[model samples]
Target: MGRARDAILDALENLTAEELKKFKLKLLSVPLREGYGRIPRGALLSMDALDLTDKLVSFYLETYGAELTANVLRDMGLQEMAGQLQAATHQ
Candidate 1:
């Protein structure tokens, strides 16, 4: 519902299939609160752009929120999108 969430979702939706795969893969490196696991390739491959975007945005919102999400996007090589996310909410 927040701007950062929508911006993050939009950025993810902008990525191509391969990019989404890379995003998911890179996201796997982010440690969770507990001993959670990774998603299967079939799960992601079966997802549409909206689904994938929702999945990612929701995950980050529940986990690290906007700043870490933006940092992750920067590490994922979407620094522009990260900055855009930063701008969407504030500096």
Candidate 2:
């Protein structure tokens, strides 16, 4: 859990500002299929890079785990970062 959490944060932190915006949109695209489970769009929108990733792992990390993080990074066109995250989980 420790390394996996760090893996995801590292991946998110790698993105530049524009890339971070794209990542957020990508994240928003997949709602939890239950209204109450959804992360608020307004909150995510207001967050800075650190807080954005902060909010991410705090909840979703336990629910979705590192694989979910890798998927999002891949979706955001961060293939290498995704692979690195994948590797960390393996380690």
Candidate 3:
């Protein structure tokens, strides 16, 4: 895994099971809405949520726009991810 992915997983380990569940659900919900139905339940359990986040960030930026993407990240208690998404805006 990449450094950011490792950091994300490390951070995730500090969360309670409920928190992890919520985070995973939030990550999965976007693709679910976009009709990527192949994602089975618990598919993200063994993977880096940051990988999903990278895809979600792209989808959100294209579908919902950057402001909403940043807002969603912020509302999800992901300030660092929000900042990273903001940085992506300039690239």
Instruction: Give lDDT per model, in order.
Output: 0.64, 0.67, 0.51
Candidate ranking (TM-score, best to worst): 2, 1, 3
Between prediction 1 and prediction 3, which has the larger TM-score?
Answer: 1
Worst 10 residues of 3 by lDDT: 1-10
TM-score of each candidate structure, all chains considered together: 0.64, 0.76, 0.41
For model 3 the local lDDT of residue 19 reads: 59
Tens digit per residue, CA lDDT, model 3, 1-91: 2233233334444446675566556655643345334344475766554555455344433334454445645767788856766665544
Over 4 Å off, model 1: 33-42, 57-65
Off by over 4 Å in 2: 31-36
Model 1, span 10-90: residue lDDT tens: 766677888767666666576566544554566776677677657666554533556656676777778776777778756
Ranking by lDDT: 2, 1, 3
Error of model 3, residue 13, in angstroms = 0.6
**1 versus 2: better lDDT goes to:** 2
What TM-score does model 3 achieve against the real structure?
Answer: 0.41
Sequence-dependent TM-score of model 2 = 0.76
Task: Indicate which candidate wins on lDDT.
Answer: 2
